[PDB]
Design an enzyme around this catalytic site. Structure first.
Site, PDB file in Angstrom:
ATOM      1  N   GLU A  35       0.543  -1.417  -0.019  1.00 19.61           N
ATOM      2  CA  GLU A  35       0.190  -0.019  -0.106  1.00 19.61           C
ATOM      3  C   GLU A  35       0.621   1.441  -0.130  1.00 19.61           C
ATOM      4  O   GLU A  35       0.874   2.596  -1.446  1.00 19.61           O
ATOM      5  CB  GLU A  35      -1.031  -0.140   0.465  1.00 19.61           C
ATOM      6  N   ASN A  46      -7.124   9.745  -5.677  1.00 22.31           N
ATOM      7  CA  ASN A  46      -8.455   8.070  -6.926  1.00 22.31           C
ATOM      8  C   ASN A  46      -9.006   9.236  -7.562  1.00 22.31           C
ATOM      9  O   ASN A  46      -9.470  10.013  -7.654  1.00 22.31           O
ATOM     10  CB  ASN A  46      -8.887   7.511  -5.168  1.00 22.31           C
ATOM     11  N   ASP A  48     -12.225   9.675  -8.062  1.00 23.20           N
ATOM     12  CA  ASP A  48     -13.515  10.148  -7.227  1.00 23.20           C
ATOM     13  C   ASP A  48     -13.469  11.128  -6.640  1.00 23.20           C
ATOM     14  O   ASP A  48     -14.462  11.521  -6.370  1.00 23.20           O
ATOM     15  CB  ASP A  48     -13.877   9.046  -6.575  1.00 23.20           C
ATOM     16  N   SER A  50     -11.504  11.330  -3.968  1.00 28.78           N
ATOM     17  CA  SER A  50     -11.454  10.967  -2.082  1.00 28.78           C
ATOM     18  C   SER A  50      -9.537  10.115  -2.816  1.00 28.78           C
ATOM     19  O   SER A  50      -9.407  10.490  -3.649  1.00 28.78           O
ATOM     20  CB  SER A  50     -12.072  10.179  -2.197  1.00 28.78           C
ATOM     21  N   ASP A  52      -6.337   8.086  -0.352  1.00 32.07           N
ATOM     22  CA  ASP A  52      -5.965   7.796   0.262  1.00 32.07           C
ATOM     23  C   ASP A  52      -4.268   8.057   1.204  1.00 32.07           C
ATOM     24  O   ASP A  52      -3.826   8.947   1.048  1.00 32.07           O
ATOM     25  CB  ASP A  52      -5.229   6.270  -0.594  1.00 32.07           C
ATOM     26  N   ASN A  59      -9.393   5.464   3.132  1.00 31.14           N
ATOM     27  CA  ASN A  59      -9.884   6.142   2.271  1.00 31.14           C
ATOM     28  C   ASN A  59     -10.489   7.522   2.905  1.00 31.14           C
ATOM     29  O   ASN A  59     -11.593   6.806   3.600  1.00 31.14           O
ATOM     30  CB  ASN A  59     -10.738   5.576   0.869  1.00 31.14           C
ATOM     31  N   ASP A 101     -15.455  -4.449   8.928  1.00 26.79           N
ATOM     32  CA  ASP A 101     -17.147  -3.808   8.670  1.00 26.79           C
ATOM     33  C   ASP A 101     -17.276  -5.291   7.400  1.00 26.79           C
ATOM     34  O   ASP A 101     -18.995  -4.847   7.070  1.00 26.79           O
ATOM     35  CB  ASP A 101     -16.073  -3.426   7.714  1.00 26.79           C
TER      36      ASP A 101
END
EC number: 3.2.1.17
Length: 129
Positions: A35, A46, A48, A50, A52, A59, A101
């Site tokens: 990562e 990203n 969209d 957003s 990280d 995110n 989650d």
């Protein structure tokens, strides 16, 4: 801060990540490697809009507030910049929420593609736990 492999494993172990939700320590170290390359200051934008953040590339769409992701949640209740600290505490605590989650570590695209089903324990070999 750029962690050494064994240094990060020890910090993660101390923060309760070894076998958290059934994921052995090797999994978290492998995920962090791919990562962020063990760099707490890693950021990636990203498509969209957003972003990280940090060692585990958490995110802004769901997990932290960076003040520039319209219509996003802040489910870990932290500024995204807190994820970039040399102290990994906020990153670890948010990761615990993410992995609980329902989707486990599949939430990390690099874990799914590069760690899942590999010999992950090799990532902690030679380390004084």
């Amino acid at each position: 801060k750029v962690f050494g492999r064994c240094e990060l494993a020890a910090a993660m172990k101390r923060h309760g990540l070894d076998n958290y939700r059934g994921y052995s320590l090797g999994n978290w170290v492998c995920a962090a490697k791919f990562e962020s390359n063990f760099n707490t200051q890693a950021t990636n934008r990203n498509t969209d809009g957003s972003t990280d953040y940090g060692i585990l590339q958490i995110n802004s769409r769901w997990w932290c507030n960076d003040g520039r992701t319209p219509g996003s949640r802040n489910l870990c209740n932290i500024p995204c910049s807190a994820l970039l600290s040399s102290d990994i505490t906020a990153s670890v605590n948010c990761a615990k929420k993410i992995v609980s989650d329902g989707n486990g570590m599949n939430a990390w695209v690099a874990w799914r593609n590069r760690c899942k089903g590999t010999d992950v324990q090799a990532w902690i070999r030679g380390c004084r736990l």
